[PDB]
Amino acid sequence: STLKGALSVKFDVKCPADKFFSAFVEDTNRPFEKNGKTEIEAVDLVKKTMTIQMSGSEIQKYFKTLKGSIAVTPIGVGDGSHVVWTFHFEKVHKDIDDPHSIIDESVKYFKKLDEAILNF
């Protein structure tokens, strides 16, 4: 299938995973664009894992199918944690670019979600 695929980035966050995941899960109540639509397809508040459906007249100009799955993992003891993110997608047509910009920005969104918790 020349349309399906995914892109997953793994990076580190300064604060413990327990507050990181919960804070992210809560912020998904706010859409990610004007006509944004998110939907919880899977979630586990113990292991800190969640899959979400995300659509909107904008992000839909490229992906007819886009899901974002997060998985957070504490590093040490109160020393930060890992945070892998994915966009299990299905583009409208094969010429659409893989979501390298949508995920680099997701990472930006996460680097800030870490600074806001850490200092608040």
From Swiss-Prot:
Q: Which cysteines bridge via disulfide bonds?
A: none
| Alphabetized SUPFAM superfamilies for the sequence | Bet v1-like (SSF55961)
Gene3D superfamilies documented for this protein: 3.30.530.20
Name its GO BP terms in alphabetical order. Answer: defense response
SMART domains linked: Bet_v_1
Name recorded for this polypeptide: Uncharacterized protein At1g24000
Source organism per entry reads: Arabidopsis thaliana
